[PDB]
């Protein structure tokens, strides 16, 4: 790889190793004043497209592009889909600018064939905090790809992020970009057993029939956290301080205000779903997961798997293992097919005790325009869309 587009950006090259003494952006002193106030060239029959995702019709655009042409599997065995009602939710929360939500429309037809996106977090990295863009969605067309149309994307909203007076993102992908900060490997916690092997998904053995399955994955209803519940508003404050207190001794988090913590938290169904434990008025635990499905591609009987991936688990009262034991049960009695984890925080430590199987990658965490040491995923505190 000869990374002639990411070789121009101010990120590491692939054989940069940088000591914990560095920490630090690429470039330094810039000025909004100097910054590009012509939008991007887009390539003939091409248009910039302000997306307003609280529009009901502009973000069923969104939702269909990402619908056909999002994230698959290296397999082309899933497609994510993300659904409109999750898309609101990941783009508005508290400061977003809409002018960073960003599409391309081909003219003659007057559809949306391009897509990406980035809301505002303040980010503490080795124990600097940074104000940053966290870049997500980024997407073209199936019909448009290998067409250098995705550095077009990435130098728009860089140059409309830095109207803001912001230099730095964070990013999440699959694929290998010059350089990850930390790389997680994703693991899996089957729960409908029988759904995910008539898939393809989960493997059977002459050891491991399916009634052994099916028993090896059943899960008692009963939580170890009795009085785990549904987050409220009244909650907010407790969590901003459990979540907050914990998220510190992390090399990479975002410092979440009362306000981010309400968005980002408070329960939406079928989108974030967030449990706390209050005992003698304080929030002592947290379990939290995010509805993301996944289209099963050319399969006649099921359209979706539909997943539940770890967001923020926090315990004072209970294990590690208990919490999560909870969450596959509160995943569970949501409907959910699949658990989904990152080895993150202290997520790695519960997933052999917890029966979860590793999956067939990891997701690597970038920064744009800082320079600072990689660590072990252990040390990342904080989970992208
Ligand atoms: C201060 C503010 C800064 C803000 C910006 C911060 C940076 C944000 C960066 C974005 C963070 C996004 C986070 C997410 O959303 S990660 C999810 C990304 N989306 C998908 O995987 C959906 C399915 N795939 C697609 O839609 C396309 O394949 C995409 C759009 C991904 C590439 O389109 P296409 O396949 O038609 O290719 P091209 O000819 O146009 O372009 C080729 C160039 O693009 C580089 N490439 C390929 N994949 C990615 C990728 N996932 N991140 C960054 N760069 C990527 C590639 O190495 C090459 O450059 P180079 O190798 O020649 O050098
Ligand atoms: O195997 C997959 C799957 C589905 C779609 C894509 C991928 N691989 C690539 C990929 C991964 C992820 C990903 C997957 C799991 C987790 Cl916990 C966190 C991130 C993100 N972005 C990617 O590009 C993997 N599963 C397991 C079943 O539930 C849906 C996700
Ligand atoms: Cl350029
Ligand atoms: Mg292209």
């Not at 790389?183 to 898939?199: F, G, M, Q, T």
């Not at 508003?233 to 309400?262: C, M, P, R």
């Not at 938290?265 to 993301?292: A, C, H, Q, R």
């Amino acid at each position: 790889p000869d990374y002639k587009f990411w070789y121009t950006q101010p990120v590491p090259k692939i054989n940069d190793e940088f000591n914990e003494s560095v920490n630090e952006p690429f470039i330094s002193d810039n000025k909004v004043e100097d910054v590009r106030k012509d939008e991007y060239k887009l390539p003939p029959g091409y248009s910039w497209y302000v997306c307003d995702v609280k529009d009901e019709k502009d973000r069923s655009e969104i939702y269909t592009l990402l619908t056909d042409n999002y994230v698959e599997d290296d397999d082309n065995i899933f497609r994510f889909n993300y659904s409109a009602e999750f898309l609101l939710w990941a783009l508005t929360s508290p400061n977003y600018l809409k002018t960073w939500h960003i599409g391309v429309k081909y003219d003659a037809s007057n559809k949306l064939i391009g897509f990406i996106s980035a809301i505002p977090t303040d980010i503490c990295i080795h124990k600097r905090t940074i104000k940053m863009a966290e870049v997500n969605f980024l997407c073209v067309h199936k019909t448009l790809r290998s067409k250098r149309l995705a550095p077009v994307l990435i130098k728009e909203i860089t140059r409309r992020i830095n109207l803001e007076n912001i230099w730095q993102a964070i990013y999440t992908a699959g694929v290998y970009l010059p350089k990850p900060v930390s790389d997680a490997r994703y693991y899996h916690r089957s729960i409908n057993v029988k759904k995910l092997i008539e898939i393809g998904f989960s493997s059977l053995n002459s050891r491991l029939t399916m009634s052994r399955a099916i028993k090896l994955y059943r899960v008692e209803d009963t939580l170890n956290i009795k009085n785990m519940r549904l987050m409220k508003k009244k909650d907010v404050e407790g969590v901003h301080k459990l979540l907050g207190s914990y998220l510190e001794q992390f090399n990479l988090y975002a410092v979440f205000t009362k306000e981010e913590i309400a968005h980002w938290f408070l329960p939406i169904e079928n989108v974030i779903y967030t449990y706390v434990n209050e005992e003698n008025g304080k929030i002592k635990d947290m379990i939290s997961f995010y509805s993301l499905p996944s289209q099963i591609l050319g399969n006649d009987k099921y359209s979706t798997l539909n997943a539940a991936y770890s967001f923020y688990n926090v315990t004072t009262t209970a294990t590690f293992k208990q919490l999560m034991q909870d969450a596959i049960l509160l995943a569970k009695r949501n409907n959910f097919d699949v658990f989904n984890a990152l080895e993150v925080m202290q997520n790695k430590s519960v997933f052999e005790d917890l029966k979860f199987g590793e999956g067939d990658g990891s997701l690597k965490y970038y920064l744009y325009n800082w320079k600072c040491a990689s660590f072990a995923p252990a040390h990342v505190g904080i989970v992208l869309l």
